[PDB]
C-alpha cells in the first residue's frame, strides 16, 4: 500500500506475497481476508495484486470451500469466511459494474470473480449473524489505525457482580501480595521503596483505601466489557459455599493448570483486543502529547505478534479462569432467533441468478432501445459501458460459473453429489427462462455485436448442455413454459427458413448477412438444442 516504492519494488513485493500466499495456509490467510474485503472493492490501482492473490487462493483451495467436509487434513470452511467471501464477491461485482470499463482491470477481475463464484457453493446459507462495530474503524482510513474502545461506563454492574468484585478483589490482593512477598517486599509500617518494605502485605479487609479504585477499575471495566457485548453470566453453588464456610497469612494457590475451551479462548482473545484498544488509545493520546515518536507497538492487534501478545492475553483470561474456579459460569450473550435452511432466498444461487436476470432484463431493455439506436446515427447511449460490462464479464462469468458448477444445477437431489449440491426445481425453471431470454437477446443481432457474438454463441452453447428440460415439464410457471414454446417457435421458423433456402438453392446483401448470421450463431445453437433433446429423449 505504501507509495514510495518504485515499480520494480512494487513488482518484487507482488511476487514475494504471491509466492508466500500460494503455499501458505488458508487458516493463516483468513486473517488477511478481513482487510482484503475492505480494500479490494475500492478498485483502485493498488487492487491489482489483491485481485490475483484472491484468484490464486480461491483456486488453490476450491475443494476446501466446495466439498462439504473438505480435505480430512485441511478441513472445511467455518462459514464466517464464507459470509465474508459472499460480501466480497457481491461488493466487487457491484462496484465493478458501476466503474467505467477499463480493459486490463476487467480481464484481471473476471478470473477473480469466476474463482470466488466457484469457491462459494450456490446453496450456501448465510448466517443471520452480522457483525457490529467491526475493526474497519480500527484499520480506519485516517492514520491506518484507530484504537476505539466501546463505551464501558454506560454499563452498570449488578449486585452479584458486586459480590464477584469483592471476591476477586480479595484474590487479586492475594496475588499482588505473594508476588511482592516472593520478590522481597515485606510487611512493615514504614514505607520505603528502596528498603523493600511496605505496610501493604496486610489482609484485604484491613488494607488501605488505595486498592479498591485500582482493583475495581480492571474488574469493573472488564465486567462492563462483558455487558457491552452482553454475555450472560451465571453462578455455581460452590461460590455460595465459600461465603458460608468462611500481616496476612501467605498461602500459595496455583494458577495455570486450569485449561479453557476454544470458544472461551476466542472470548478472551476479543476482550484482550479490547484491552489492546484502550491501551493503544492512551499511548496515542500521549503520542500527540509528545508530538512525534511513532512507537513500534502501534501495529494493530491482528498485526501484533505472539511474544508481545502473551503477557497481555494471559492477564486477559486469568480473570475468567478465576471466574470458573470460584464458581461462576459465563455463556454467550446472543442467540440467533431463526435460521431458515429450506428458504430459497438465502441460497447464493438464488441471489446470483436473479441478479443476473435483472442485469439481462436491463440488457434486453437496452437492446429494445438499440432496435432503433442501431437504426439511429450513433451507438453513444448511457449503456455502452453497460453492454460492454455484459459482453466481457457477465456471460463469460456465466460460462466460468457453470463450468465450475456443472453437476450442482443438474443434481435435483437426484443421485449425484450425495453429500450435497442440489439445485432447486424453481431455480432450474428460472435457469431455463434465462436461457430463453438470452436466446431472444442474441437472435438477429450477431452483426450488431462487436466480435463478441461468437463468444456469446459458445457461452449459450455450453449453457445448452448445462440445461435440463425435465423439471420444466414436470413443474413450471406458465410464463416460463410460454418462453420455452417461444424458443421452440423461433427454432421452428429458423428451421423453416433453412428448408426454404435449401428449397431454392441448397448448394453453398441481406441474404448474405442472414446466412452469415446463421453460420455464426444458429448452427451451433440448433446443434446444442437438438443434441440435448436427442440425448434426453425430449
Amino acid at each position: 500500500k505504501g507509495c514510495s516504492l518504485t515499480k520494480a519494488q512494487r513488482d518484487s513485493i507482488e511476487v514475494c506475497l504471491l509466492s508466500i500466499c500460494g503455499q501458505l495456509r488458508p487458516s493463516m490467510m483468513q486473517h488477511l481476508l478481513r482487510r482484503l474485503v475492505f480494500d479490494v472493492p475500492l478498485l483502485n490501482e493498488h487492487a491489482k495484486m489483491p485481485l490475483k492473490l484472491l484468484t490464486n487462493h480461491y483456486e488453490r483451495c476450491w475443494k476446501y470451500y466446495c466439498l462439504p467436509g473438505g480435505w480430512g487434513n485441511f478441513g472445511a470452511a467455518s462459514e464466517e469466511e464464507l459470509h465474508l467471501s459472499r460480501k466480497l464477491f457481491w461488493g466487487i461485482f457491484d462496484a465493478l459494474s458501476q466503474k467505467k470499463y477499463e480493459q486490463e482491470l476487467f480481464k484481471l477481475a473476471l478470473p477473480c470473480l469466476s474463482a470466488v463464484a466457484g469457491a462459494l457453493p450456490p446453496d450456501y446459507m448465510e448466517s443471520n449473524y452480522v457483525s457490529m462495530m467491526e475493526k474497519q474503524s480500527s484499520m480506519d482510513s485516517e492514520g491506518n489505525f484507530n484504537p476505539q474502545p466501546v463505551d464501558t461506563s454506560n454499563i452498570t454492574i449488578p449486585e452479584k457482580l458486586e459480590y464477584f468484585i469483592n471476591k476477586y478483589a480479595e484474590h487479586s490482593h492475594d496475588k499482588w501480595s505473594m508476588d511482592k512477598l516472593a520478590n522481597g517486599w515485606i510487611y512493615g509500617e514504614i514505607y520505603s521503596d528502596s528498603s523493600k518494605v511496605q505496610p501493604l502485605m496486610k489482609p484485604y479487609k484491613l488494607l488501605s483505601e488505595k486498592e479498591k479504585e485500582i482493583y475495581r477499575w480492571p474488574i469493573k471495566e472488564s465486567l462492563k466489557t462483558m455487558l457491552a457485548w452482553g454475555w450472560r453470566i451465571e453462578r455455581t453453588r460452590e461460590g455460595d459455599s465459600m461465603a458460608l464456610y468462611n500481616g496476612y497469612s501467605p498461602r500459595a494457590i496455583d494458577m495455570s493448570n486450569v485449561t479453557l475451551s476454544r470458544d472461551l479462548h476466542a472470548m478472551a482473545e476479543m476482550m484482550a483486543e479490547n484491552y489492546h484498544n484502550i491501551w493503544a488509545k492512551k499511548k496515542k493520546m500521549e503520542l500527540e502529547s509528545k508530538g512525534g515518536g511513532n512507537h513500534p507497538l502501534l501495529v494493530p492487534y491482528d498485526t501484533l505478534t505472539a511474544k508481545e501478545k502473551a503477557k497481555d492475553r494471559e492477564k486477559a483470561q486469568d480473570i475468567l479462569k478465576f471466574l470458573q474456579i470460584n464458581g461462576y459460569a459465563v455463556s454467550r450473550g446472543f442467540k440467533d432467533l431463526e435460521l431458515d435452511t429450506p428458504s430459497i432466498e438465502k441460497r447464493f444461487a438464488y441471489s446470483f441468478l436473479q441478479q443476473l436476470i435483472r442485469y439481462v432484463d436491463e440488457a434486453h431493455q437496452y437492446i429494445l432501445e438499440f432496435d432503433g439506436g442501431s437504426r439511429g446515427k450513433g451507438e453513444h447511449f448511457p449503456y455502452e459501458q453497460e453492454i460492454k460490462f455484459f459482453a466481457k464479464v457477465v456471460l463469460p462469468l456465466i460460462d466460468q460459473y457453470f463450468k465450475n458448477h456443472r453437476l450442482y444445477f443438474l443434481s435435483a437431489a437426484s443421485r449425484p453429489l450425495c453429500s450435497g449440491g442440489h439445485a432447486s426445481n424453481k431455480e432450474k425453471e428460472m435457469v431455463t427462462s434465462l436461457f430463453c431470454k438470452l436466446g431472444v437477446l442474441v437472435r438477429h443481432r450477431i452483426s450488431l455485436f462487436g466480435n463478441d457474438a461468437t463468444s456469446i454463441v459458445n457461452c449459450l452453447h455450453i449453457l445448452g448442455q448445462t440445461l435440463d428440460a425435465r423439471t420444466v415439464m414436470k413443474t413450471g410457471l406458465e410464463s416460463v413454459k410460454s418462453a420455452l414454446r417461444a424458443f421452440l417457435d423461433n427454432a421452428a421458423e429458423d428451421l423453416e427458413k433453412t428448408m426454404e433456402n435449401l428449397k431454392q438453392g441448397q448448394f453453398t446483401k441481406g441474404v448474405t448477412q442472414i446466412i452469415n448470421y446463421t453460420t455464426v450463431a444458429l448452427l451451433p445453437m440448433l446443434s446444442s438444442l437438438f443434441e440435448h433433446i436427442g440425448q434426453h429423449q425430449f
Binding site: 480430512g72 460452590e238 459455599s241 465459600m242 464456610y245 498461602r251 494457590i253 496455583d254 495455570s256 493448570n257 486450569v258 485449561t259 474456579i325 429450506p342 437431489a413
Partner: protein, 723 residues
Amino acid sequence: PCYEAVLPKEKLKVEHSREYKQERTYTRDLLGPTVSLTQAAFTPIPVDTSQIVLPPHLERIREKLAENIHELWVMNKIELGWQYGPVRDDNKRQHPCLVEFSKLPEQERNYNLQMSLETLKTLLALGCHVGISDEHAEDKVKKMKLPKNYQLTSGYKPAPMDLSFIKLTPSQEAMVDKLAENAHNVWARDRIRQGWTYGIQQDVKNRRNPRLVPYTLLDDRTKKSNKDSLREAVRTLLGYGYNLEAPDQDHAARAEVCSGTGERFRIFRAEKTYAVKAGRWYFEFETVTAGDMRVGWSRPGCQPDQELGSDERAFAFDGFKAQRWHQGNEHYGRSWQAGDVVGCMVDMNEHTMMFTLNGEILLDDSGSELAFKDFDVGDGFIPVCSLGVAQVGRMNFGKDVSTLKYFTICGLQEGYEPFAVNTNRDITMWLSKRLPQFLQVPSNHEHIEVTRIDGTIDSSPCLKVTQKSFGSQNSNTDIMFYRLSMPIECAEVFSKRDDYDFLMQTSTYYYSVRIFPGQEPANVWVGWITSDFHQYDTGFDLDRVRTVTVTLGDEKGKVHESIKRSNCYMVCAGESMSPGQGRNNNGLEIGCVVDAASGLLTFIANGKELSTYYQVEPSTKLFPAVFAQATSPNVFQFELGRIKNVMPLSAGLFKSEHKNPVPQCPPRLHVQFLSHVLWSRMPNQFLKVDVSRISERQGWLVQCLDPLQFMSLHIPEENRSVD
C-alpha cells in the same frame, strides 16, 4: 410363557449366541458390526400438540366437521350391516352411537369433539400449514344422496360431499400414513395408562393384546380400515376447501452410524506368520451384500482400531466410493452390488497390486491398469478385509483351486498363485476383539504419558499420569480408564508413632490419589476394580456399574444373608469434596483403605471418612483404578504412601515385601489403560451342535457328543487366561 414374546411375523428358533459356528472356511459368513436392536422394545413416542394454537377457521369448523365425520363412520357401520338400539352392548347387535348429538351418549359426544380437535390440531403439529382456498368453498354446501331406506329412520340426511371429487398427492398419502400411526400411538398410551401390554393372544383379564405393535407391524385389514376411515375424514377436509401445503421431505440420513456397542467396523486378516516376502499371489473376496467394505493387503503392523486405508500399513479398496485406499482416498474402479466377487492380485517383485471385479480388471482415473504404483517390501503383506455395519462377506484364500470363481478367466494365465495353493492346514483368522482389554501405556502413545517419580525419604513413591497431547488441536476429550497391574488378594476365609506389632499383624492396605489443581474432580473416579471390569463408555457414572445381589435362604425360604457382587467399587471426587478448599488450595487427596481379612472398602478423603463403603466377598482380586476425564495437562497421581497404623500397598501386592513397613514401588507395578486395539484368534475347530424342534410334543433339541479341548495359558497377576 417364553413363546408369548416372539414377534408376529418372526419364527422362534434356537440359534448360536455367538456369530461364528463350525462350517467350511470359504463359506464362513464374516459378520461386521450389527445394528442396535432398539426397536425391539415398542415405546409409542408421538408428537405433542397441546403447546400450539389453532386458527379461527379451525375453531368454527371443528363442530361441523365432527358432525359430518361421526355420521361418516355411522355410514360405514350401516354399510357393514349395523343396527341401532337403545342398549349399549354391541354384542347384542344394538348400540346407541348412531343417533345424533343430543341423543347419543354425551361421553362419546365429547370424545368425538376432542378427537376432531386433536386431529386438526395434529394437522398443524405435523409440520403442515393449512389455509382455506376461498370463502366460497365453505359457503357452498352440496349434499349427494344415500338411500334413506337403507339408512336408519333418523331424519337427518347422512351423505355429504362424497368420496371422489378431491385429488391425491403422494404427500397426502404419506401424511395420512403418519397421522394414522399417531392415532394408534395415542391409543397405545391409553392402553398403557390402563395397564395393557402386548401378548400373542388377546386376553382382557391378563391385559394382553396382539395389536399393541408398531404401525408397520400391525395387521393389514385393521390398519387399512382405520386408514381409509381417517383419510376419508381427510376427503371431507379437502372438500371444505382447507388447502394444505406439504412440508418438503427433509433430507436426513443416519448413514448407519448407530451400531452394536461402540464398534463401527470390524477388520479381518490372516495370521501374521503367513506374510509373503516375495512372489505372485491371488486372493478373492465375495460380497454377499453391498456395503462400506474394504479388501486389500495389510502389513503385520496393522492396527485393528484404525480404519483400513488411512495409514501406510493398509492397502485397500472401497466399493461404493469407488475408492482405492492408502494414506488417503483417490478414485479407482466401480461400485459393486450384492453377489459381486473381487479378486485381489499382488506382485511382490515389481511392486504392483491389481484388483478384478467379477472377472474384469479395473481401471482408475489414470490410464494405469494397476492400483498402487510401487511400494517397499517391508515385513510382508497379508490379506485383509474390513466389514461395516450390517455387512457380510466371504474370504476365499484358494485352499481349493476350483472354489475360486474367476481365477481361471483372470489370474491363472498371468500365473498368480492362490494364497493357499500349497498349504495343508486352514489359515488362521485374526479379527478385532470387541471387548476392550487393559494393557501397558505405550511410550509412543501421543495422548497418555506416565512419569514414575522416585520416593524420597520425605516423599512417597508416586506415579503421575499427564496428558502431553492436551492443550492442542485434534485432541479427544473422552474419559480414560486407568489401573495398576498388581492386585490385592482378599482373605480366603473371613474371620468372624505407629504400633509396630499392630502393623505386623494387620492386613489393611492403603494408597492415595492426588487430584491436581485445575482438573475437574467430578470427571475423576477413584476406587477398586476387579478383573471382570470390561466396560468402556463415553459417559460413565456410578449408576452404570454392573451389580447383582445373590440372596441365599434357608429351607423355609427366609433369606439368612444376602451377598452383593460388583466388578467396580469407586467414589466420585467431585462429590468427595463437598465443603470446598479441598481443591483450590491443594490438590484433592483421596485415600482408599482395603482390609484383606474383613473385606471392607473404606474411603478416606482429607481426613474425613466418607459415608460410602463396600463389602467384598472372600478371595476377590482388587486392582487400584482411577477413571478420569481430561481437563488439564496434569490429571492425577498415584501415591503409594501409608497412613497411621495401615500397612502400605506394596506389602499387599508383593509377598516378598509382606513385612516391610517402608512403601515400595517395584518396576513390576505400572499403570495400564483400557485399549480397544487388540487381536482375537478364531479357532480352527468349533463344537458341532445340531439344533432342531423334534415336534410340538417334544420341543427344540440341542445335543453335542464330540469333545474339543484347548490349552489355556493363565496369566497369574492379571487373573486372565489366554490361548
